[PDB]
Amino acid sequence: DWGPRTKRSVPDMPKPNAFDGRTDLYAHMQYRPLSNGEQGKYAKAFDDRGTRG
């Protein structure tokens, strides 16, 4: 019954963040364990800004 959706549909907004692709706060709000392929990023860096050193 719904009409056509207005105001377009922007692709990829908000952008997936660099320094691992984070589009949600589900990891923090679900306490999921860190994967081994992604643990090294937080091993090297503190914040979500990538590879400063």
Partner: protein, 427 residues
Amino acid sequence: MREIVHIQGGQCGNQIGAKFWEVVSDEHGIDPTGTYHGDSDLQLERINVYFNEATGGRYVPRAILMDLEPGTMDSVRSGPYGQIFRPDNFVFGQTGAGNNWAKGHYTEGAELIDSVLDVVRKEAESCDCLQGFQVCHSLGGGTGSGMGTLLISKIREEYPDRMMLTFSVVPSPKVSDTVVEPYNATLSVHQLVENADECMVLDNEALYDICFRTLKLTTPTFGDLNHLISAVMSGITCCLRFPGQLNADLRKLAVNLIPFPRLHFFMVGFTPLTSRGSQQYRALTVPELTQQMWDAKNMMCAADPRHGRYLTASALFRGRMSTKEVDEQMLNVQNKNSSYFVEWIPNNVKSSVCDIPPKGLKMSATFIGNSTAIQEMFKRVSEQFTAMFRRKAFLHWYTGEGMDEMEFTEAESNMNDLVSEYQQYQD
């Protein structure tokens, strides 16, 4: 078998409930198509607090999304978990309140109030026991604050024995989003004292700060900010949806947290906020959920709780926990810093434990604090309102839809009256 009816207004209200009903849904194990595929029997026991059972296993919420523009519902039309809502419960406008508190309340407000209250009345009679009405809106805006605050005053007239949870966001002190921000805020708090029974104070600047120093995120979107707000709203009614060793419903917090009927502005907090970098190293036990509960950085309000005394506090614990560790940690915070608590009330802390944690977390807890430090927030908005009203700037709009300066002087009078009694109790 008590129920909560959810009503939302404006840009801010609708985007929260797009995430709020999303967070509630996967706790109960129901898909965005509405069917239930959960693996736990305890989820289906108390569904009626938030959902109507339908034919074929569909579950539709008590969600009444109010707005004056079709833009907000368009996001709800296409956003994730937006197909669960009742299409009949999307009351909409066409003109838009235009960030004007006078347009949403008086002149253009009346054309939709008789229609939005019809949707509320249909849902109110369908469920048997009404614990109360829950609204989530803004205050600095005009669509969800102007139309919302009239809607709260009307629904207290029809249902005066039912409680009123309001989750209203507040103008930030450091930054600003709109220009008529103190105008629409002081007119709403002037009405929010009379009608609403309890208020949770939120603001984006504390949600922005809590995403930085506690979560280590330098790119928080609004959808990141709505998730932390949605965790608080699930924590208030976690006692209704799930069992517990000690039970505290919505009305039990009302007699606890409100000493006098006008002191119903609280500050919120969510305990297990761990960054992903430091996720493994922290442990999950009651003493370290409490140490992040009482931190001033964990509060999602502008007010520093170190400035003002805690008149009454509440804690909504979730998880398999010892009752002593709930009791002793909240007893230690009454002895270690007793200057931050009110002397003439013994045991300012309300505690309750529910045995069902959220999804994934072993333990969680939600904090509600009736602090007198909230007067710092109300003073700043009243400070901005007197600065702009004495020049009568931006006032030729509000007088255009049928307002005179009598209630503008009345709004500052009640604003100065409610902040006066906070500082009287602090001495």
